[PDB]
Amino acid sequence: MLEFSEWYSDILEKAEIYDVRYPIKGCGVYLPYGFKIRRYTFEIIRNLLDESGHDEALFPMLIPEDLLAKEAEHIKGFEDEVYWVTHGGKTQLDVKLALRPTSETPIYYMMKLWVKVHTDLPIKIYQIVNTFRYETKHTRPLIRLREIMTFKEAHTAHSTKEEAENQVKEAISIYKKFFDTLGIPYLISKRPEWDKFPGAEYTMAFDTIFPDGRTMQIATVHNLGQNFSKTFEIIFETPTGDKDYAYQTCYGISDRVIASIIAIHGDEKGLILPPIVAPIQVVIVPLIFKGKEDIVMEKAKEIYEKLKGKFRVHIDDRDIRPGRKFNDWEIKGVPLRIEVGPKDIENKKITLFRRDTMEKFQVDETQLMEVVEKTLNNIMENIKNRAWEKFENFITILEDINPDEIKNILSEKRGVILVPFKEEIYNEELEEKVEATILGETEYKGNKYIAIAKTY
């Protein structure tokens, strides 16, 4: 019965996902549940990056004036939003250490110390650190944050413009396949040549449209070529002896996913989060009755141990109206829930609940495992479609660039606006024209269109 903004802000608490009362506005704390629904959230990208030949490592958080000074050119749109550590306690530091906004500055300074010959390449390295960002605008939970809680930034370096180029497509493939297992409707774009990362040749970026019509970039890939490699003397000996600066390329994702995981799927009753990330995929509720209280709790365990292997199960020993329980777990979006009842075991059956369609059925205790699996899949497959449908439904594919029309069709329909692509009038005016924000170039079934839309 409430609009997104507060529904989100609400559930993002009633779900015990992220307390935000920490005295800083931009720095909330990930409560137990949230953390979990993140451990399993990133474990997915970690694996996709590990199988893909990446290697995670951890870099410092403090970037000194020196290096950071390289990140920019004059003081370009960068240093302006950065925290600085000036006092080394009571005294000054002689060295203005800074809180890592991005984190490439220190990683590149390092690749130098690692890349010497052409055999050192490539070094697709990544990390999931916590960056910062002096945010002047308004903060928004798990989205626009003063202190970003989960920021996975991958870095890779190659020996050629071609290897780099391809690395981007591999990444894009990773992020794609990643979101998919998370079930997140994405629209892949090529940020215009004026919304470019600092020193990037061009940028690709996954954008999704939250339930409010507003879009939100969640994933990002940039191709850097040598723009950095130079500034950081990250050179190397071509297989011919001669010297050549390395071709970088980086990509990152932030808490914005978990925000989107929350929204995209979450419903009025609260969460719904995909089973691939359910801190508890299945909840076992032992309904205690005056008679045969013991047997039930026994059945609970039997079910636990059985599901325990392939799945994440939890039981509500707790003393309280199964209601609050049923309700408490629905809000938390636990995919499946098993009611362990008396008149229920007597018939040799056990009853489940799909926290997605909220439909409740029974089934033979001898097919549990098979069911829980199939049911748990069906759910994902479903929530994933529901996700895609609401997505595709928000996407309007115009056939012509009438600006006075787009801004008009965006203040009623919203979501994203795809119009045929023609370099012609594809400049910054277009935005100061449609008065929106060009998500950039994009291909949607065949050729390329331009993606216009309202952003977060």
Residues making up the annotated binding site for L-proline are 102, 104, 133, 222
CA distances from residue 389 to 7, 232, 455 in whole angstroms, order as listed = 21, 46, 20
**Among 60, 194, 364, 408, contact with its own copies (rule: CB under 8 A):** 60
Among 98, 131, 95, 127, CA closest to 110: 127
**Cβ count within 10 A of residue 333:** 30
Q: What are phi and psi of 127, to 5 degrees?
A: -155, 155
Using CB under 8 A as the binding rule, whether residue 61 contacts its own copies is answered as yes
Using CB under 8 A as the binding rule, whether residue 130 contacts its own copies is answered as yes
From 15-23, 157-165, 270-278, 421-429, span contacting its own copies (CB under 8 A): 15-23
Using CB under 8 A as the binding rule, whether residue 243 contacts its own copies is answered as no
Using CB under 8 A as the binding rule, whether residue 388 contacts its own copies is answered as no
Euclidean distance between CA atoms 286 and 339, whole angstroms = 6
Q: x/- binding map, residues 144-163, to its own copies, per CB under 8 A?
A: --xx-x--------------
CA quadruple 306, 307, 308, 314: dihedral sign = negative
> Using omega within 30 degrees of 0 as the cis cutoff, is the peptide bond preceding 122 cis?
yes
Ordered alpha helix ranges (H), 332-394: 342-346, 368-394
Q: How far is the CB of 90 from its own copies (least distance, A)?
A: 6
Q: How far is the CB of 93 from its own copies (least distance, A)?
A: 8
- Side-chain half-sphere of 21: how many Cα atoms within 13 Å? 5
Q: How far is the CB of 28 from its own copies (least distance, A)?
A: 8
Q: How far is the CB of 364 from its own copies (least distance, A)?
A: 31
Q: How far is the CB of 125 from its own copies (least distance, A)?
A: 7
CB closer to its own copies, 27 vs 235: 27
From 1-9, 62-70, 237-245, 293-301, span contacting its own copies (CB under 8 A): 62-70
Q: After which residues is the chain broken (C to N over 2.5 A)?
A: none
Q: Give yes or no for a contact between 155 and 229, defined as CB atoms under 8 angstroms apart.
A: no
Q: Give yes or no for a contact between 249 and 126, defined as CB atoms under 8 angstroms apart.
A: no
From 131-139, 225-233, 336-344, 374-382, span contacting its own copies (CB under 8 A): 131-139
CB closer to its own copies, 131 vs 375: 131
Using CB under 8 A as the binding rule, whether residue 291 contacts its own copies is answered as no
Euclidean distance between CA atoms 285 and 334, whole angstroms = 12
Using CB under 8 A as the binding rule, whether residue 88 contacts its own copies is answered as yes
CB closer to its own copies, 123 vs 380: 123
Residue 206, SS3 per DSSP: strand
From 141-149, 342-350, 353-361, 362-370, span contacting its own copies (CB under 8 A): 141-149
Crossing angle of helices 256-265 and 32-51, in 10° steps, is 110
Gyration radius of the chain over CA positions = 25
Using CB under 8 A as the binding rule, whether residue 290 contacts its own copies is answered as no
From 81-89, 180-188, 376-384, 410-418, span contacting its own copies (CB under 8 A): 81-89
CB closer to its own copies, 316 vs 344: 316
Euclidean distance between CA atoms 311 and 64, whole angstroms = 46
Q: Tokens 């559930």 label which residue?
A: 11
Euclidean distance between CA atoms 191 and 219, whole angstroms = 12
**Cβ count within 10 A of residue 246:** 31
Using CB under 8 A as the binding rule, whether residue 288 contacts its own copies is answered as no
CA distances from residue 311 to 299, 383, 428 in whole angstroms, order as listed = 17, 19, 50
Using CB under 8 A as the binding rule, whether residue 30 contacts its own copies is answered as yes
Q: How far is the CB of 244 from its own copies (least distance, A)?
A: 23
Using CB under 8 A as the binding rule, whether residue 66 contacts its own copies is answered as yes
Q: Site for its own copies (CB under 8 A): how many residues?
A: 54
Using CB under 8 A as the binding rule, whether residue 108 contacts its own copies is answered as no
Q: Are strands 55-56 and 125-129 parallel, antiparallel or unpaired?
A: parallel
CB closer to its own copies, 48 vs 99: 99
Q: Which residues bind its own copies (CB under 8 A)?
A: 19, 21-24, 27-32, 34-36, 39, 55-62, 64, 66-67, 79-90, 95, 97, 99, 106, 109-110, 113-114, 125, 130, 132, 134, 136, 146-147, 149
